[PDB]
């Protein structure tokens, strides 16, 4: 408690066989597991959100935590898309007439 005892003890009692200490070190001395995500779908959520219409299943899907490592840089993603599309218009059309007719097929 917040100082309301001298000390404290946690005894491990093995009663059937040796406890294979090598995994004892994996549990006691080891950082806790990373905060993963277990988002899943069930009939109840969809049925409840279908009758009333203020959200969508794609919105809760994308705004979840499983898509976080993907949607952390979305704004930058469409910004780069816009810049690259602008860069598309700056390229003159390569010659396709004459003896360069087979140029796209040659590239392929």
């Amino acid at each position: 408690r917040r100082g309301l005892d001298p000390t404290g003890t946690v005894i491990l009692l093995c009663k059937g066989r040796v406890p294979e200490m090598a995994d004892l070190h994996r549990m006691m001395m080891g950082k806790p597991s990373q905060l993963q995500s277990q988002f899943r779908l069930t009939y109840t959520m969809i049925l409840n959100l279908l009758r009333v219409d203020a959200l969508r299943v794609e919105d809760m899907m994308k705004r979840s935590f499983s898509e976080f490592p993907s949607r952390k840089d979305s704004k930058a993603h469409e910004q780069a898309l816009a810049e690259l599309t602008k860069r598309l218009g700056a390229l003159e059309e390569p010659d396709m007439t004459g003896q360069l007719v087979d140029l796209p097929e040659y590239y392929s």
Partner: peptide, 11 residues
């Protein structure tokens, strides 16, 4: 906010 040095040490 995070802290260290948990009180009432236990072994």
């Amino acid at each position: 906010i995070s802290t260290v040095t948990r009180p009432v040490p236990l072994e």
